[PDB]
């Protein structure tokens, strides 16, 4: 069959799972005077799920 890349591997945090790298850091962002908040690729579902 035709080989395709797995689409789930695009997450930067998943590039090395089960390794202890304490110097990995999390960024934040501000939206025009709004509340500064954590920047993830999909942080909304981690924050408040869906529905």
């Amino acid at each position: 069959r035709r080989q395709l890349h797995t689409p789930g591997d695009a997450d930067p945090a998943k590039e090395a799972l089960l390794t202890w790298k304490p110097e990995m850091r999390v960024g934040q962002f501000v939206k025009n005077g709004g509340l500064a908040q954590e920047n993830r690729v999909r942080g909304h579902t981690l924050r408040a799920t869906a529905g």
């Binding site: 509340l35 908040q37 999909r42």
Partner: protein, 438 residues
Amino acid sequence: MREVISIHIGQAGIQVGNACWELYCLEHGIQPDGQMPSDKTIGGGDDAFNTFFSETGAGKHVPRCIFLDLEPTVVDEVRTGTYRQLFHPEQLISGKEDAANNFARGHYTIGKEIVDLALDRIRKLADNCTGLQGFLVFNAVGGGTGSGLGSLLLERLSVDYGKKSKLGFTVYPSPQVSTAVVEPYNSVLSTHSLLEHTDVAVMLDNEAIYDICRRSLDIERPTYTNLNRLIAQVISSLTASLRFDGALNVDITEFQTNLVPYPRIHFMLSSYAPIISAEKAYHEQLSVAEITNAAFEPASMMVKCDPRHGKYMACCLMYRGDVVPKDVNASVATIKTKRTIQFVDWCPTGFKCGINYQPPTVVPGGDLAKVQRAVCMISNSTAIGEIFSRLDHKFDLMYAKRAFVHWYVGEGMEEGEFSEAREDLAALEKDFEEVGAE
């Protein structure tokens, strides 16, 4: 998560919706085509909360709103206007023929077919959002689409979405400056449904905003465009605590527990304190104590009623801009020590103060000037019983020998449904009197 779904019913709902979404786009910097500029979107692509927009793919925002109206020629102007590429095309809902000032047509005959299609997009917007706080409803009770489809839609969201707040900004018939003959009929039947379905209803009156434009703005020639651009300023300042943070944030759910003391009593007045034209704003010193006095003036009320006639149950203060949290406290002490206004004896603490850190954004081409501070005052008063009693008097005059009844009777409704709304409004009238009684 903080998010609201705005729905706009009737001709007045769409025109207010055009003015409000023009204000929301300039608040967040969204361009009319629907794309935030490239310098703004350089940050994180995640959008953890936006109470009025949802991120679509890459850099595209669609409003969380539906434009439903039975007459196609009003929503088609949105569909051909400068905001064509902003709104989702399926979200704009048209119809074949308008209700034509008929509560019977908007609720039974022609409003029943389109309300199922309206609920389809509400469900498609409910699952898309995660934290739903409430529904914002914009309609005028004088029209058939605003009354009939407004009553039918709010009845369905009550059953489908239990315990969700439904804050409805409604336009009621004016004592003098009113445009329709059957406004007393449509407004009385609207209050039979708006009483128990909506959570909080903020009264808006047509000629009271006319008097603000003539006096404060010195615009001798005002139209509906000028009225809605500051009606929208009320809505944005009311919900500014969600989108932007301040010292004392006040959510939509913080309104309901602090403003209405009884389930049946949920009609509110509205006030916007600094409403100053361009040439008057520079010389005037817009201080916190100065605008707080102006918010409680009878002229600055957007409902044609005198607050001195009634008594204030509770007051909500939506402060915007550079406001330290004690000059609002110094203003409340000066307001509450005044004897011209009257707070009821059983409510020792009556003020709900909320502060936001952003000044109101001025609409380009608008009539308002850029001001550092703003106070949006929402109050519960017993003077609102003057508004419903006058509409009760006009409705009883024409119903005395049954004028304009064959239009309503023929289009589905029965004769006895007129008396039920009359009794519901009359029982509501004594409810306002007994709560103001000491």
